[PDB]
Amino acid sequence: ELPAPVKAIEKQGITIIKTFDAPGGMKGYLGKYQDMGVTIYLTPDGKHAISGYMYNEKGENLSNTLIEKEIYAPAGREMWQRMEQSHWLLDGKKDAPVIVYVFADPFCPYCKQFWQQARPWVDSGKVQLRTLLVGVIKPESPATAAAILASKDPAKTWQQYEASGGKLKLNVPANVSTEQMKVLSDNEKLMDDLGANVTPAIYYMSKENTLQQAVGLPDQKTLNIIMGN
Amino acid sequence: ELPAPVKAIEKQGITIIKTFDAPGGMKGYLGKYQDMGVTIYLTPDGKHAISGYMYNEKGENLSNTLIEKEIYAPAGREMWQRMEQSHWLLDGKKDAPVIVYVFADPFCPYCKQFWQQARPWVDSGKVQLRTLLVGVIKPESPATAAAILASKDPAKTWQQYEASGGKLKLNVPANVSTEQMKVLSDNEKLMDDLGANVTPAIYYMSKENTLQQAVGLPDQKTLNIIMGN
Numbered sequence: 001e002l003p004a005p006v007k008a009i010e011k012q013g014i015t016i017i018k019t020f021d022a023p024g025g026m027k028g029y030l031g032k033y034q035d036m037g038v039t040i041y042l043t044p045d046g047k048h049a050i051s052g053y054m055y056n057e058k059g060e061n062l063s064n065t066l067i068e069k070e071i072y073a074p075a076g077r078e079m080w081q082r083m084e085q086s087h088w089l090l091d092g093k094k095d096a097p098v099i100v101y102v103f104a105d106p107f108c109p110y111c112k113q114f115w116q117q118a119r120p121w122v123d124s125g126k127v128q129l130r131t132l133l134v135g136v137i138k139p140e141s142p143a144t145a146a147a148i149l150a151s152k153d154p155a156k157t158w159q160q161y162e163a164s165g166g167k168l169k170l171n172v173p174a175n176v177s178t179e180q181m182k183v184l185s186d187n188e189k190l191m192d193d194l195g196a197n198v199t200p201a202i203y204y205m206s207k208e209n210t211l212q213q214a215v216g217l218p219d220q221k222t223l224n225i226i227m228g229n
Numbered sequence: 230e231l232p233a234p235v236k237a238i239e240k241q242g243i244t245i246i247k248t249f250d251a252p253g254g255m256k257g258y259l260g261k262y263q264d265m266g267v268t269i270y271l272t273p274d275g276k277h278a279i280s281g282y283m284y285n286e287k288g289e290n291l292s293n294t295l296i297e298k299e300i301y302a303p304a305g306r307e308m309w310q311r312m313e314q315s316h317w318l319l320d321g322k323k324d325a326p327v328i329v330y331v332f333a334d335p336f337c338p339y340c341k342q343f344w345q346q347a348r349p350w351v352d353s354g355k356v357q358l359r360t361l362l363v364g365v366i367k368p369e370s371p372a373t374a375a376a377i378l379a380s381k382d383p384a385k386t387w388q389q390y391e392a393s394g395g396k397l398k399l400n401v402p403a404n405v406s407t408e409q410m411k412v413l414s415d416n417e418k419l420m421d422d423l424g425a426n427v428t429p430a431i432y433y434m435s436k437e438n439t440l441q442q443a444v445g446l447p448d449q450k451t452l453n454i455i456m457g458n
Contacts (some may be wrong), residue, residue: 008288024273044253044273048291054272054282061238062277172301 076211
């Protein structure tokens with residue numbers, strides 16, 4: 001079966017995912033304890049195993065890197081793709097290295113405050129905010145979001161709208177177009193799939209491309225991390 | 230200096246105590262993170278180190294054993310000796326394998342309840358309770374404790390006293406003898422040195438002879454552990 005020392009560690013509540021190659025003639029085992037990723041290393045003598053974190057000369061926590069890359073990160077990747085394939089509005093330079101998605105409703109105070117918080121990074125060209133509009137808070141949310149999407153330059157209109165705290169006057173059409181309704185409904189479903197029904201629901205990448213989430217108004221630390229600082 | 234991989238781990242908040250021999254050509258380092266003991270193992274390639282716990286074929290957590298034996302346990306040993314050298318009263322067989330010390334006052338409800346809880350183990354000859362009397366709760370505590378020490382068979386009198394819930398009538402002398410006062414004062418100082426002023430203050434051995442403490446009335450789990458079950 002499995003080496004005795006490793007079997008002993010399994011009995012401590014660990015479920016093995018797979019085996020992997022490690023340095024120094026050691027064999028590695030990737031697993032989980034409850035929801036936590038863990039790495040086990042079989043010693044050269046083969047009669048001992050160490051459950052813990054391996055570091056290299058440069059000081060990188062190799063176990064952390066592997067756990068984030070193979071356990072925590074994967075499942076959310078297809079979601080990041082779905083957001084990229086959605087009809088989002090661009091706020092910032094198209095080539096900004098840091099991409100942040102935000103599900104926002106026209107009648108949401110914190111969406112506006114987050115928009116303001118992000119200015120330094122967006123204006124410097126470091127971050128680009130991609131907004132996926134939804135109409136779920138107020139009776140007029142759908143129509144207002146659709147009106148923004150119906151404007152000549154939706155992205156600019158949204159920026160002006162958020163900058164004005166929602167005081168920006170708009171031309172609200174006689175009805176929501178079928179295309180606008182599809183965008184809003186598709187965005188709402190994706191938002192629901194991501195797990196947070198409250199706006200703003202902010203998504204960004206960190207920790208070996210793990211899809212991260214922030215809901216509501218981020219505090220200073222979370223903001224700096226979202227912005228890739 | 231120290232191997233680079235180990236130096237990297239030190240930077241994560243670890244302070245090294247000493248180096249030690251490990252299996253498979255690996256070098257071990259014993260240290261602490263805050264108040265927690267930790268073990269680090271340098272890999273055969275010498276360019277990596279693992280911070281974690283080593284297990285053997287029999288399933289023993291060797292790191293835990295070493296940490297308990299060399300870090301957590303030592304400092305309290307001299308205290309266990311001081312209790313053994315004190316004037317305690319025996320409750321149970323002199324050859325009972327499990328020794329439990331208890332600092333008790335004559336006017337303490339929980340001391341009496343703990344005494345009752347311990348009967349099964351004391352009567353089976355598995356545990357021996359060694360009581361170090363103190364007189365600190367009530368005005369009459371000193372005189373009553375001294376009266377017990379002054380009786381023909383102090384140990385039996387104490388047992389009868391606890392069994393009766395303190396209703397056992399006693400012959401209280403005209404004064405506390407100098408020897409009785411020395412016992413009470415010495416016991417009180419040792420109790421204070423151990424860190425718990427509340428009675429009952431219970432001491433026992435577990436985890437590689439680490440001096441353990443229980444204060445007040447132990448719940449079922451703690452009781453079973455104190456009794457060595």
